[PDB]
Nucleic acid binder design. Sequence first.
DNA 1: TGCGCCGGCGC
DNA 2: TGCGCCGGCGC
DNA 3: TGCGCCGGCGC
DNA 4: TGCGCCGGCGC
Lengths: 286, 286, 286, 286
Amino acid sequence: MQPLFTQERRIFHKKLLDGNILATNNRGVVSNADGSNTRSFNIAKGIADLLHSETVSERLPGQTSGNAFEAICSEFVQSAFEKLQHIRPGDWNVKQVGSRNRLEIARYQQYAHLTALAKAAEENPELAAALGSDYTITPDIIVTRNLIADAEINRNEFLVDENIATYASLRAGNGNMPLLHASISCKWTIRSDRAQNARSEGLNLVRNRKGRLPHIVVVTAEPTPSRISSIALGTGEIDCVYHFALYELEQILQSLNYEDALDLFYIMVNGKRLKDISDLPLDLAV
Amino acid sequence: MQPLFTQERRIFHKKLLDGNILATNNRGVVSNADGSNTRSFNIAKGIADLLHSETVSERLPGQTSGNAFEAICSEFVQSAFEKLQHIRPGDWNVKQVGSRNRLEIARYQQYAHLTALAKAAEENPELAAALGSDYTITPDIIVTRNLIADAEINRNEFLVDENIATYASLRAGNGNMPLLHASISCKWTIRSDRAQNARSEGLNLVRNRKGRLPHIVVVTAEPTPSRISSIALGTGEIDCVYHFALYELEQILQSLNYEDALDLFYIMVNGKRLKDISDLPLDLAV
Amino acid sequence: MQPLFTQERRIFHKKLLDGNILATNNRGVVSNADGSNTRSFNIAKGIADLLHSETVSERLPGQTSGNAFEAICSEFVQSAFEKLQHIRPGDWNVKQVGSRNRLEIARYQQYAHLTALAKAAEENPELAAALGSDYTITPDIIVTRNLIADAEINRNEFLVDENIATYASLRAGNGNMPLLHASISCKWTIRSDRAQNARSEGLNLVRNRKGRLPHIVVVTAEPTPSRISSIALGTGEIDCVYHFALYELEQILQSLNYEDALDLFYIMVNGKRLKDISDLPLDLAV
Amino acid sequence: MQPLFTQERRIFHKKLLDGNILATNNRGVVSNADGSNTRSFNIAKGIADLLHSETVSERLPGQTSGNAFEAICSEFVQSAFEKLQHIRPGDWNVKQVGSRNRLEIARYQQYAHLTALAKAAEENPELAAALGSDYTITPDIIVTRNLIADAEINRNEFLVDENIATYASLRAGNGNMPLLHASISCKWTIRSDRAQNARSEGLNLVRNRKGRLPHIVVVTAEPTPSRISSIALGTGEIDCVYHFALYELEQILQSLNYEDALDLFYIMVNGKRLKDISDLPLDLAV
DNA sequence: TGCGCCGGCGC
DNA sequence: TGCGCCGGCGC
DNA sequence: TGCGCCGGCGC
DNA sequence: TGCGCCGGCGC
Ligand SMILES: [Ca+2]
Ligand SMILES: [Ca+2]
Ligand SMILES: [Ca+2]
Ligand SMILES: [Ca+2]
Ligand SMILES: [Ca+2]
């Protein structure tokens, strides 16, 4: 049959189709297009043909398509990542946090101290104002790793006891919390202004961490390379951007002769800023 | 037996005593102390006593203790990290880079674009000037990961063929290099001004990466908490600092009844900015 | 009569009213409210009463209200700033750039080199991909300062000739461009996601500058302190946020007893992150 | 007469020759040279010759040349900047801070919150640890601006009463302190590692400011371009570097026929990363 | 070579 | 309540 | 006091 | 064409 990552990739698409997240309205507008832009329209039509989309229905409201894209991205990650246990073992959990959560990063080892700052600020309003703060990281999807018992550390050799390596992050106990492995931002579609919150979130993770920075990634179904470029280009905040259908996007850009769009596409891909959704699970194993 | 990490820790200490790196001169000054300062003198002597330091010899040139401390840290990480294959598998290398070689990080995937950038500056002086920046990132010790065969991704299951997950960093071939896993900076002793180059370096890794940030840590044998804090305190550049002899420092701070410095020790240690050398191998397995 | 800044402040409001930028629809929704949020509705109603708004008309499309708010903010700045010539002299120009421009910062001394990087990237696609780039700063409104002749430098004393101070930024000649004094972002209303492009723009200005960083400021008519807070709180990117009607906002928060909103309001104002529109001209003279 | 800035420049040089800061020891080593290196030896001797350095004495202790170079830079800036009141008016102070005093920038408006932050850490150790960071920003030389009376804002026109522009930074009273205009770091000579503390400091000013960023510059007497470049190259932390004797350096680089170093000089100078001491007073008037 | 190592100690 | 989701489209 | 200055020179 | 504007509102 298919290789399993290939099957999960199609499962991923099938859920977008089945849910009418991806569909075409009766004016021929594919639902991830900017219907008032010809290039967006054409690129999204082609991807949707390549994905064998057939349903005709009205575009879903954006809150609905945004939410569903996250859940569906979340299910793909969890399912594929859990097959990489021999390359990246651990007690992994993949969670869609939500578009309504907050303070959630403080749940995790590298950012726990942010609980203490918040509580300090609410108690002392002078401290609140004097503070820079910035404890507002609300990821769409997290991947976390729970902590390991000595039994696991000492699986094959007597490596540790209670008198050595007493601060190691992976060691369960002393009120240690789970590690944040990845923050995954989802963008069903992009406009260059609303795309920038992924950068500020990446930036917040970078500047406030105690310990190893998580993976910071963005997944998008945006059809146009230019809008993808407002989040993908540049370094420092975002590790890499992953497209819901890269291969399909490549094909359509080639057959349409949007030559600047194709050039921008290769700049990002060859520039290590844009990958396929199927590359994400393995990139989470590095 | 002792746990193996406790044995490794004692081997790291005995390399510093045996190699005359950590020793006491004819005036009673321990060789990581700042002899002009009573507290640094007393804290360092206290650490040497708890390490059972016995040798009398004159302080080595700075350049020699610097290099030697670095080799011995490098050997500790390599021997101890190799025990952790079941929690962080792979084909790992640990290397002690040096000022001799140039453009070292650019041999690794997340920073390879820096070669192209330098070649571009080199041929066009107008471009060299426009970009401004030249010199590039040179950590003391790096840990790198070699890439993985398809047979090993597919060890258990038919996960990938050559038509899926084709940009994934860990996958061998496709114009791929090894991955930088960790940048480890060493400071045998510290002065607050010359500590800061570990921060500019950390920042360079951060801002320039394509892919997940490496581990960015500092290992130091500095005796006084105030000097350690010049590098330890704060977040954003350094993941964590590792003391060469944390338990002994804590113990001497208590015995010398230096409460202000004991406070600062705990600010750092309780604040997750400072740990023992022995936490580092497990911290690199996150 | 009124002090002149007070008159410009009312002129500013009158243009928002006259243009129906600020008005109330026939359901009682004030046009800067989020009509589906009760607190937004109530706060905007009160400000609009305090500004003596009377017109009833349908909300303008967002592209129209956004554009007009910029022009109107632009006219206020220019007009008031030009009265500060004795505190901040110079050949000043205030320009609404537009929501369609690009590369415009490269027009200015501190960012000119960005022209060279763009031209280098389009010529060499390998260089394009290898590049980090990030020359995408599109301010809404700029303030610039043209360069000064020796006659002005030497107005009262013979300070300079052609053999001293030959690189001074303010000196006209040798193909020197005008200085960027300020970038002013306008946000008629806010949602926390679309607010973050002001941060990335501020960040781009910070990281790419050669010479003194411009003022980086945000002007907003957003009624709710919480949405204002998604751009105002935190430091490093934005110098300060200026509200189109702060005094009115203070009054209404007090009379409504939204006590957490009032607390957040004082956190920002007392925390030097939020000011009135009338404070901007003087803050541009520092 | 010479132009006044040319006279000031010669007075700055003669303070270094007369004060024995810049001199040649009995071995022919000029006192800002690294005697072990032929190029630094030759470039420094060449600069001393063009400055008409005549004194023979032994090199002063590092601590003394460091401090003395700093006082003399400070005096140059103060005397020359005072001539620029017609292009940058105000009530300016120039001061040479020192390691003796602590929490110096916090006396200025944009960084006053740092006092509150430190007081908060000091009373609550859990908070001190949560925040992590303690120590704070200590530039070598600062230029500050005192605040302005209402009579002077209203000198020409009735601009403001007490009901408008009530949070404006420049306006005296209302719980206002002076403004930090410039942070000036000095490095009599450089080594690449100890250069980097001017970068961490620059970054601290950047990231922590409430209001416009101060001028952030470095003045250095370092002879070799490679060492100057360790601080000069790049953007984001330092606005610009200023050489103590740029014309003389350029001239010696040409006469010594050191083409590689001449290149690097131009990369820096043409790239707007390096200028002469004499450009600094006008650069602070931007 | 020259970069970046650490040390001594003045302010 | 409220935060952040995407969509329509003018300038 | 102790922080942050610069210097010598090994690798 | 295309970039960035704001608005409606679900989850
Ligand atoms: Ca999202
Ligand atoms: Ca080092
Ligand atoms: Ca805007
Ligand atoms: Ca200095
Ligand atoms: Ca010495």
